[PDB]
């Protein structure tokens, strides 16, 4: 599959665990490392860990290898590299600190 339908899958998994304020950024013009950045958050450290696992699971289930999970234990910012698509899961109180959206304020943003 192509990154667009991989994107579509990841946001479904995120919406499944009630991911808040979930957005995607098109990184094609802006980066060689990936095509999309997904940004979403949860309200507690369990929900951020669950949204991450949900992204892993629904990506396994279609046989995509989650390449790495970063900061899964601490559950503040969990980065799930699917390579074509990179999913950032943030604790509610951490998202605004990093403000990924405003760092790439010229990337095509889509919200859900």
């Amino acid at each position: 599959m192509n990154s667009q339908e991989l994107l579509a899958i990841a946001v479904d998994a995120i919406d499944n665990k009630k991911g808040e304020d979930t957005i995607s950024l098109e990184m094609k013009g802006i980066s060689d490392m990936t095509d999309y950045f997904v940004v979403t958050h949860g309200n507690n450290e369990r929900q951020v860990q669950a949204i991450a696992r949900a992204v892993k699971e629904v990506a396994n289930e279609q046989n995509i290898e989650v390449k790495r999970m970063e900061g899964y234990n601490e559950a503040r910012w969990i980065l799930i590299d699917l390579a074509d698509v990179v999913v950032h899961v943030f604790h509610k109180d951490e998202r605004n600190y990093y403000n990924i959206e405003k760092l790439y304020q010229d990337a095509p943003l889509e919200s859900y």
Binding site: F37, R68, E70, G71, E74, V86, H88
Partner: protein, 124 residues
Amino acid sequence: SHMIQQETRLKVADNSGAREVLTIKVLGGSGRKTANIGDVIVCTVKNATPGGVVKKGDVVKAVIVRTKSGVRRNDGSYIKFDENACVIIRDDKGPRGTRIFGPVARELREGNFMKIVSLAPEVL
């Protein structure tokens, strides 16, 4: 023009408050004393910016993100940078700061520093 080892000074390339560190130890199971891109080091903050979270004298870990004695890719490409630079990191490898300054080498993604990659303006 020379490699990174104990007692070598490095610019900090993030908003952590640290501006310049002093290496005290290269980490890594090889026990070897050279650090390059993607290596974690221990260092003491020798210069800091007022109002930052990280203050002079603190002991921190940092990942090397630019080396002026560069490394060669699987590609046969050899990349180099004009300066040595690192990024202060937490224990789980997430950046202490929230912003990265200048170019970082793409090896960080394989190092599991993909958070630093995602914040960096330029990836070489």
